[PDB]
Nucleic acid binder design. Structure first.
Ligand SMILES: [Zn+2]
Lengths: 56, 44, 112, 123
RNA sequence: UUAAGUGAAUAAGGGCGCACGGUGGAUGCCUUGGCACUAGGAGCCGAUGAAGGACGGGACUAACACCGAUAUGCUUUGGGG
RNA sequence: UAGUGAACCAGUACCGUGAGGGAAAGGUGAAAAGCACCCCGGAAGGGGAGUGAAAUAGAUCCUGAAACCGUGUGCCUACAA
RNA sequence: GUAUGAGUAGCGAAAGACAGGUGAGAAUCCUGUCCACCGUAUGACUAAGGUUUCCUGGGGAAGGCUCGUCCGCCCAGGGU
């Protein structure tokens, strides 16, 4: 089928109350205090578990 | 399938040429009718 | 005196709705939190408002202020820019237009 | 299980990935491939422990037939062929370890597709 | 303390007013270009190769204009500083 | 959007094998004096500092309406056809 | 000129994975290995037709149904 009418200006902003973005799980490190994701390797630190993993 | 505008070089100048539009009294009408507008390409 | 340096970026090739999502996550927060938030969102409009905040912070440092650690993002806008226009061949001969949109992104950084 | 592709393409994939970690001992891939490679690498090193074959003649399926891993000379250029490394190095490293030979870490989403990524090591 | 009765305020989002921006080119003003005529001129060009063109000519040359292997020009007679 | 179809390199771009059909597009300031130099950024873009009577006249450049899209807020809204 | 439909349908038949490069930035570019597809053809040579798409060195504003350091794209030189 085919839409019957123009949807007004109100029903846009009544649909779109569930078109949000959310951040989840930001914690402070143990070694630099920089907010980095829990259960994840800290990117600038390189310091998961207090152990440097990215090693060559 | 085959469509129409399948080009050649002998046919598009032994049909729409110049030496077939200075060979009638209707090719001359065509050339003189195109020069009134001032078209650049007169024929092929 | 003054506070609240500005920074903009005109005609950025992103759709303006999909960049109004990210700016909802920054309004009213300190600068220390906001960069950390923007590094961990995998969207295209993350890696742009990062550069706008960094340029606004650098304006506030190297023109007027001190106290980088007492700045608050107080206003953020998304405005629509000039759209490009192209076409695309749909089936059975016809065609249908395609917008290509652009946005203008600004960030104002007061102290508190 | 975890379906990824058609039937024979999973066998191709899990033979392709798990002959790395035998040559390089570190891999950067996604989540799901990593958990299947957990299972298959830990099933192949325990054939690495026996030394019969039956250890040879079952490892001739989930290992690529010859992929050389050469950093060695005595006076030659002698070759470790990605199965001989199982029956020479990785075998006797785990004579006192039970199961559980792998670690999985959680790094970043990929730029293009936002697929979350993973490092696999051994120890 | 029990019991019976009366019950405000907060908004995930939305409406109205106001204030400030962005997109878009209406309206205001203006003129290289047109329209309709008046008075005078002129009313043909060509085998001594016409109209219309193609290719070329500059220090740099894509296009317009101008010119033709003497090619962004040659000779002469007047004007002009 | 008028006036020639054509104020702008228009019988052009483009469409059809062909005869043929045929558009849109004017305006910075008096003077280019068209932003040296510094900072963010790969660049685009921006903030100072200058030119200028004016830069909210910065080249898509006089004025800049309406639909349309945003920000902030004085009042109201979760037993209602 | 701008909406609604809506951030919806679609993204045009096919097998990739890892390591190392370059770079502000990489699943999409380069290199290496293994795997896989056609093999009376998805292999070679020419006639039409197209008209510089060919080669070398740069570039990433628009085109590429995503990304793009790449290209039959843009700039400069050069080849029959
Ligand atoms: Zn840390």
């Amino acid at each position: 089928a085919v839409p019957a009418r123009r949807t007004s200006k109100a029903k846009k902003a009544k649909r779109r109350t569930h078109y949000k973005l959310t951040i989840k799980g930001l914690n402070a490190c143990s070694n630099c205090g920089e907010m980095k994701k829990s259960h994840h390797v800290c990117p600038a630190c390189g310091h998961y578990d207090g152990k440097d993993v990215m090693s060559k | 399938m085959k469509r129409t505008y399948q080009p050649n070089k002998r046919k598009r100048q032994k049909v729409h040429g110049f030496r077939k539009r200075m060979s009638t009294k209707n090719g001359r009408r065509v050339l003189a009718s195109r020069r009134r507008k001032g078209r650049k390409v007169i024929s092929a | 005196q003054i506070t609240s340096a500005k920074a903009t970026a005109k005609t950025v090739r992103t759709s303006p709705r999909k960049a109004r999502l990210v700016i909802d996550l920054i309004r009213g927060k300190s600068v220390a939190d906001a960069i950390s938030i923007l590094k961990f969102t995998p969207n295209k409009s993350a890696g742009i408002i990062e550069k706008v905040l960094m340029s606004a912070v650098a304006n506030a440092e190297n023109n007027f202020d001190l106290d980088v650690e007492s700045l608050v993002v107080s206003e953020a806008f998304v405005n629509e820019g000039p759209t490009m226009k192209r076409f695309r061949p749909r089936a059975k001969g016809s065609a249908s237009p395609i917008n290509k949109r652009t946005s203008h992104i600004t960030v104002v950084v007061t102290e508190k | 299980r975890k379906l990824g592709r058609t039937s024979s393409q999973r066998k191709a994939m899990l033979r392709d990935i798990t002959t790395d970690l035998i040559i390089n001992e570190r891999i950067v891939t996604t989540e799901a491939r990593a958990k299947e490679v957990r299972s298959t690498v830990e099933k192949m090193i325990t054939l690495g422990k026996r030394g019969d074959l039956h250890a040879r003649r079952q490892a001739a399926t989930f290992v690529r037939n010859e992929v050389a891993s050469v950093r060695e000379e005595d006076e030659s250029i002698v070759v470790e062929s990605a199965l001989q490394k199982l029956f020479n190095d990785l075998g006797p490293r785990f004579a006192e370890r039970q199961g559980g030979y792998t670690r999985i870490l959680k790094t970043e989403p990929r730029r293009g597709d936002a697929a979350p990524m993973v490092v696999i090591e051994f120890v």
